[PDB]
Amino acid sequence: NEDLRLHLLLNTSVTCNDGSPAGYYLKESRGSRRWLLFLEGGWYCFNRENCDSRYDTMRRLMSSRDWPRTRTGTGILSSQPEENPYWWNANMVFIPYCSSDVWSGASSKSEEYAFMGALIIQEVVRELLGRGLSGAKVLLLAGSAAGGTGVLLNVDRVAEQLEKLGYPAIQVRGLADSGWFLDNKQYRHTDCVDTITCAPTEAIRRGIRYWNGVVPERCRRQFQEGEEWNCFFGYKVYPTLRSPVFVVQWLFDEAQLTVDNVHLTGQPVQEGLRLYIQNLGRELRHTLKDVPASFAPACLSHEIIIRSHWTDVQVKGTSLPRALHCWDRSLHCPVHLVDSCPWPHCNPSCPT
Ligand SMILES: CCCCCCCC(=O)OC[C@H](N)C=O
Ligand SMILES: *[C@@H]1O[C@H](CO)[C@@H](O)[C@H](O)[C@H]1NC(C)=O
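^ inputs. structure came back:
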């Protein structure tokens, strides 16, 4: 039908965690010169014991053995005008997340797991050139959660790749959704034993060495050798980016609260935790005041750009698809939309 069809990478040396071939889903649209490449999320694992436990409970995120042959685009990947009013006719690409490395892993493997997230992106771009990308006018690299952080790490690498390959007319852009995190203090400190409850700084310090991860070169210059973990955090890597990037971020991101050891039950929140949550949104609000193209509602949620109801969230009377359209036209109707109200779900258009 309108579905994206699975393609496995021809270079079988670029694999998922377990050695199965990586791949991508593609839906071609011959009349359009716009391309949407989406990076999937799904946390990470930074040592053998967590990656083994991840392999037993969430096998889809470390292997391609169970991928379906087709997939339906949703949200900004949907081809239905009612669901994607501005970009429904674009070429759609969906890259599944099977490297557990926040799309940072490079180099090859010895014997346990392989971490080739940055090489998977590179190889998809190579193959897509033979399937019509060579004629593109705009390449928008998008992603959610871990894929959103992966956009910040890879958007300038794709730009330089396409220049080196001889396609300087393609305008490369980035869209990072729910990948803008703070290396802050936990609400209640725990020891870095499990994945989702290890502090953000320590998680990336261990991960980048375990994955052989790479960061943008211009950001690596700003921090001491051995402190490359800084470049995994949006407000530190953003000032050195060269491609234009639109930042979508819930002010109270639920994944951010998870690594901060905050667990929301159906109880009434006490003070100090209410203060902690309130202080989080203010610091994230502060990091965005110099980001011209941003969209930050004051909700407690995670991810949105490939959810079907992304057309319903609005900040100051402007929807998310509208803001992306205004940003699109400005590169050839505001684009800086951050909520001013400081408590969660003060925006009436928050999801449920
Ligand atoms: C600074 C690094 C923090 C990365 C946190 C990533 C969280 C995530 O990737 O969330 C996945 C979501 N549950 C599914 O898509
Ligand atoms: C295939 O991938 C491997 C993995 O790193 C790489 O070393 C090699 O150069 C690639 N070859 C081609 C033709 O893409």
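The radius of gyration is 19 Å. The chain has one domain: 1-352.
thumbs up if we can close this ticket
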